[PDB]
Structure formats: structure tokens, C-alpha cells
Amino acid sequence: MLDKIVIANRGEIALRILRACKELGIKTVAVHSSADRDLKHVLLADETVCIGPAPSVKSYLNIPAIISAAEITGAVAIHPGYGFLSENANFAEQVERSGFIFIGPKAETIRLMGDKVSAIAAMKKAGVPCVPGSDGPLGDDMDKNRAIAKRIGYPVIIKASGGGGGRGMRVVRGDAELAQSISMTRAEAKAAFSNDMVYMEKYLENPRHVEIQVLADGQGNAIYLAERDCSMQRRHQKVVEEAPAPGITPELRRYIGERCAKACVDIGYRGAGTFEFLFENGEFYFIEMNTRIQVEHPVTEMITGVDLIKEQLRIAAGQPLSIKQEEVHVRGHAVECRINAEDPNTFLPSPGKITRFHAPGGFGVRWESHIYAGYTVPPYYDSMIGKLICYGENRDVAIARMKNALQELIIDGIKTNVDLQIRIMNDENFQHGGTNIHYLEKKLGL
Ligand SMILES: CC(C)=CCn1cnc(N)c2ncnc1-2
Ligand SMILES: [Cl-]
Numbered sequence: 001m002l003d004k005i006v007i008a009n010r011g012e013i014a015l016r017i018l019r020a021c022k023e024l025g026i027k028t029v030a031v032h033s034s035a036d037r038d039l040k041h042v043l044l045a046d047e048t049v050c051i052g053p054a055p056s057v058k059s060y061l062n063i064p065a066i067i068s069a070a071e072i073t074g075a076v077a078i079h080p081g082y083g084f085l086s087e088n089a090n091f092a093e094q095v096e097r098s099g100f101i102f103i104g105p106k107a108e109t110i111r112l113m114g115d116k117v118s119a120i121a122a123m124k125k126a127g128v129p130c131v132p133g134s135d136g137p138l139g140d141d142m143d144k145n146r147a148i149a150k151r152i153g154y155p156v157i158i159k160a161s162g163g164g165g166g167r168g169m170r171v172v173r174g175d176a177e178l179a180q181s182i183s184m185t186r187a188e189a190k191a192a193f194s195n196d197m198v199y200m201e202k203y204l205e206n207p208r209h210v211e212i213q214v215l216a217d218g219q220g221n222a223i224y225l226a227e228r229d230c231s232m233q234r235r236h237q238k239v240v241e242e243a244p245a246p247g248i249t250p251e252l253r254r255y256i257g258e259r260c261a262k263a264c265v266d267i268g269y270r271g272a273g274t275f276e277f278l279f280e281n282g283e284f285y286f287i288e289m290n291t292r293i294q295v296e297h298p299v300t301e302m303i304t305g306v307d308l309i310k311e312q313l314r315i316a317a318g319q320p321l322s323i324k325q326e327e328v329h330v331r332g333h334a335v336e337c338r339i340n341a342e343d344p345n346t347f348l349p350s351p352g353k354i355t356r357f358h359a360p361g362g363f364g365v366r367w368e369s370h371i372y373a374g375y376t377v378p379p380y381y382d383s384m385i386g387k388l389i390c391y392g393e394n395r396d397v398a399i400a401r402m403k404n405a406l407q408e409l410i411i412d413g414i415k416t417n418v419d420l421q422i423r424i425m426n427d428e429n430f431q432h433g434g435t436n437i438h439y440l441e442k443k444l445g446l
Contacts, residue, residue, distance in 0.1 A: 002026050002077045002101065002317050006070045007041065009081030010060060012386055013295075015041040015370045017079050020309035031069045033059035035378045040370040047073050054380045060084045063091055067098050077101035077316055083382065086292040087114055103316045105270045105291050112267065113289040117161040117199050123286045126263040131278070131285040133201035137161060142179050148200055149178055155203035158185040162193035164288050166236025171203050204285065206436045207278035209233070210245045212260045213300045214273050215311050219320040222264035224257035225304050226330045228296055231437045232424065234347065239417075239440060240424055241296035241336045243303050245279075246395065246433030253330070256284050261325070272297075272312050278437075295338070295387070298368060302334035302391040333395040335402050337421040339369070339386040341377045341414045349383040352376065355413035360405035364391040364398070367405075377414055385416070395433065399425055 004027035007017050014030065018041045021028050030045035035054035042048055049072065051065040052058040059065070061084060070078055078095050080086035086104065093107040104110065113119045117137055124130050134148050138158075149156050149172065158181050160168035168189050170181040182198060190196035208231045216222040229245035230238045244253070260275045274290040297308045306323060314322060343350045357373040369386025371377070377385055390405055392398035403425045409418055427443065429435050 001319075002313060004029060004046075004073065004075045005077040005079055005103070005313075006031055006066065006073070006075045007045070007081070008060070008066050008078050009084060009086075010036055010039060010041075010381065012368050012370050012384070013081040013293075014039065015044075016368060017041075017081060017309055018044055020307065020313060023307075024310060024313055026313065027075075029069060029073045029075050031059075031066055033380070035380055038375065040372060040375075049073065054378065056084070056380065063094060067094065067100070070095075070100050071098075075100065077103055079103040079312070080292070082292055082294055087290070089114060101316050103271065103312055105273070106268070109267060109269060110291050113291045114164075115161055116159065116164060116288060117197065119289060120199075120286065122267055123263060123289075126259075126266040128259050128263050128275070128286050129284050131201040131204070131287065134199045137197045137199055138182060145178060145182060145200070146175055149175070152200065152202050155205070156200050157203040158182050159199055159201060160185060160189035160193065160195070161197035161199055162189055162195035168192065204278050204280050206438065207280040207285075208245070208434065208436050209238075210248070210277050210279040210284070212257055212275045212277070213297070213308070214260055214264055214269070214275065215306075215308070215315070215321055216264045216269045216271065216273070217315045217321045218270060218318055220265070221321045221324075222261045222269065223321060223323070223325045223328060224261050225300050225306055225308075225328055226253060226257070228299055230296060231435055232430070232440050233437055234440055234444070238296065239338055240421070240430075241299055242395070242398075243299040243334050244330050252282070271315050272308055295384070296336055298366060298387065298389045299334040299336050302366065302389060303330050303332055304328055305331075332391055332393050333398045334389055334391040335395075335398045336387055336389045337402060337406065337425075338384050338417075339388060339409075339411070339421070340383040340417045341385045342383050342417055343415050344417070344420065349379065350415040351379040352414040354411060356410055357412070358408065358410035360388065360408035362401070362405070364401050365389075365405045366391070371411070385411075388421075396431075399431060 006029045028045040030042045030048045031051045049069040085091040089107045089110040092102045095102040155173045158170045172181045186196045213225040228243045230241045232240035277284040341350045353376045359367045366389040390401040
């Protein structure tokens with residue numbers, strides 16, 4: 001087991017990682033900005049290093065500062081959590097070059113799956129179903145681009161290869177908009193990624209977002225841990241997640257899971273990862289792979305019993321997976337509501353000082369948050385301040401427990417989305433299940 005690690009993150013996920021480390025007897029080094037001295041996990045960590053001022057560019061994105069912290073404390077590995085540098089292949093490469101273990105895949109694998117064109121080609125080769133598309137980048141020949149659009153069939157969508165997560169894409173429903181849509185998508189990618197590569201895919205009108213959790217070790221084992229539905233979104237930001245996904249049969253779960261596990265073997269994947277799909281008319285279509293742990297991992301933990309952070313750490317130390325595929329069973333149902341410090345009318349972040357705080361409790365209730373009474377949510381980072389996860393023997397019990405837990409949650413002094421989450425739990429279409437990626441925005445419009 002790893003002697004000591006740097007937790008290269010903040011907020012709820014840093015706390016999540018710290019607890020896993022403590023369970024395994026791994027010493028913790030909490031690197032933090034000057035604005036984050038009073039983070040719960042920093043206060044609980046074995047050692048702390050202030051790596052820079054509040055702005056992320058000088059702290060949580062500061063590669064030299066993070067590697068220096070690892071060097072100075074005699075740490076042996078770095079866990080990047082999610083966001084920040086977790087999908088930064090150059091960072092992973094520098095970590096391993098500097099002699100530390102990166103808790104994630106090989107840098108080459110991060111790079112492969114961080115290029116959407118190259119990622120799709122690899123998934124297609126491995127036998128994972130993808131969206132019909134250009135299977136290659138678009139050039140400047142509009143005769144050729146119209147022909148690709150014709151072959152796919154309108155509507156199509158133009159997507160940046162260096163993008164992802166709903167960033168940098170345009171829907172095209174006819175030839176008259178194709179040239180300008182390609183040109184604008186290209187320009188925005190060049191400005192944002194210094195990578196002007198774009199591709200074309202079939203546009204799916206009303207899909208659900210369904211993603212598959214995998215784990216792969218250094219001994220050749222690769223397993224899938226069922227799926228999560230993350231269709232409840234606003235501007236491509238997930239708001240509620242659940243596992244398993246309503247209406248997915250054991251046969252479908254098996255079909256898609258095995259293809260994901262096989263893909264991991266083919267690409268030499270290591271650690272935790274997620275295959276994201278659009279699901280429509282009973283069919284899966286790969287869009288992207290997240291080569292890292294995700295925000296919503298706890299719903300999969302609740303339904304499988306597998307501690308995914310502890311698995312990441314075990315894999316990094318050179319231990320095989322603690323469970324075999326035949327030992328992975330979906331039991332019960334879990335729902336996650338993201339708790340955001342945000343204004344209810346503008347949806348902009350709403351930082352400030354929490355004056356009273358009370359967490360819900362009870363059977364099947366899991367609260368993931370660093371916040372406490374008297375804690376100030378700083379303005380420099382993401383609006384998500386906690387995650388409420390509720391488990392039940394079925395989806396209805398999970399939803400009932402969430403309603404009750406949301407009612408016990410007290411966060412005064414700042415504006416939050418608790419009331420909105422209560423509205424969603426009480427929504428008759430959500431209670432039925434299987435709502436698509438457009439539903440929340442449709443509801444919020446009403
Ligand atoms: C609603 C929207 C802008 C996109 C939803 N959507 C539809 N079709 C595809 N092929 C996609 N790839 C990523 N997202 C996709
Ligand atoms: Cl994430």
C-alpha cells in the first residue's frame with residue numbers, strides 16, 4: 001500500500017479521498033490555496049502545504065507547485081480527483097517522469113481518450129457502439145462535407161475533437177447552415193483549445209445520458225460496475241444522477257458492460273474510468289470516456305458495495321481488483337442530488353458564509369460534503385458544495401428517502417438549489433423515470 005499521497009484537489013472530493021486514505025492507513029498531504037486553509041479535509045490531513053494564492057491557475061492548476069509539495073513531504077503518489085488536472089495528460093506525464101505515481105491511467109491513455117476523434121476510432125475498433133459520423137476530422141472541402149452530411153443524414157452535429165461534455169458543438173439540420181456551423185465550431189475550438197479539429201456525428205433528438213463505470217488493474221483484470229443515468233441536466237451540467245438506470249434490463253446491462261470491459265483490455269486501461277453513452281430507442285452510442293473518477297461515483301458504490309476510491313488506490317499500489325465480475329451485483333437503487341451554492345433565478349454561483357448548517361441522517365442516507373457552520377464558500381471555485389446520496393431497496397424508496405433528507409438539510413447564509421432538488425424529486429415524470437437530457441430545461445421553462 002502507498003505510504004503517503006498528495007490529494008491534488010479540494011472541497012468534497014478531497015474529503016472523499018482523505019477518508020479512503022485513512023481507511024487504508026495511507027498518510028495524507030493536503031495541498032491547498034490560501035483561500036482554502038479551513039477546508040475540512042485540510043484540517044483533518046496529516047500534513048498540509050499551501051501551494052499558492054486563491055486563483056486556480058496559481059494553486060490547483062499549478063503543476064510545479066504540486067510536484068514540489070509531493071517532493072518536499074516525501075509523498076509517493078498524487079490523486080488528482082476530478083476537474084482541475086485530472087484529465088491533463090501533460091500533468092500525468094510530468095508526475096511519472098518526476099518519479100511519483102499518478103493515481104489514474106497512463107498519460108498515453110489520457111491523451112488517446114482526450115481526443116474525441118481518436119477515442120471514437122479506438123472504441124469502434126474495440127466493438128463499442130458509437131454514433132454514426134465522419135469517422136475522421138472534417139477538412140475545408142464543403143463538397144466533401146455536404147456528402148458526409150448526406151451519408152449520415154440530417155440532422156447532424158459538429159463537434160470539436162479537443163472538446164467534450166457539451167462544450168463546443170453545433171446542430172445542423174440542412175445544407176444552408178453547414179458551412180457556417182463548421183466554421184464557427186472550428187473558430188471556437190481554436191480559441192479555447194488551440195485545436196481547430198472538428199468532426200460530424202448524427203444528431204440524436206431525445207437521448208438519455210447513460211454511463212458505465214469500469215475498473216481495471218495492472219494484472220489484466222477489467223470489470224464493469226453497472227450504469228448510471230445522468231439525463232437531468234442544465235446546460236450540460238448534471239444535476240441529479242441515479243443507479244441503476246430505469247428501464248435497463250440485465251441483458252442490456254450485460255451487453256454494454258462487457259463491451260466496455262473488453263475495450264479496457266484492448267486499450268490497456270488502468271484504474272477507474274467511465275464510458276459515457278447516449279441511449280435512445282434501446283440503443284447505446286458512445287460519445288466520450290472520462291479517464292478519472294467522477295462526481296457521481298457514490299451512486300454506483302451504494303448499489304454494488306464497491307468502494308471506488310479505495311480501489312483506485314489499491315490499483316495504483318499494484319494490487320489486483322478486490323472483486324471479480326461474477327461478484328459484482330446490482331442491489332437496490334441510489335439517487336444523487338448535487339447541492340450547489342447558486343442563485344435560484346440567475347443560476348450564477350452564490351458564494352458566502354454559511355451561518356447555520358445541519359446534515360440529514362438515517363438509514364440509506366449518505367452526505368458527501370466539506371461544509372460546516374461558519375464555513376465560507378469562496379468565489380474562486382465551482383458552485384457544487386455537497387452531494388446528497390440516498391439508497392433504497394428500490395427506486396421509489398430511494399426517492400422517498402431523498403425527499404425526507406432534503407427536508408432535513410439546513411444550509412443558511414447562502415443561496416442553494418435545495419428547493420429545486422425538492423421540486424425535481426416531486427416531479428411526476430421523474431418519479432415515473434426515464435426522462436431525457438432536455439427535460440429539466442423544459443421543466444424550468446414552464
Ligand atoms: C442537445 C445537444 C446540444 C447535444 C446532445 N447530443 C445529441 N447528439 C449527439 N450526437 C451528441 N453528442 C454529444 N451530445 C449530443
Ligand atoms: Cl466529473
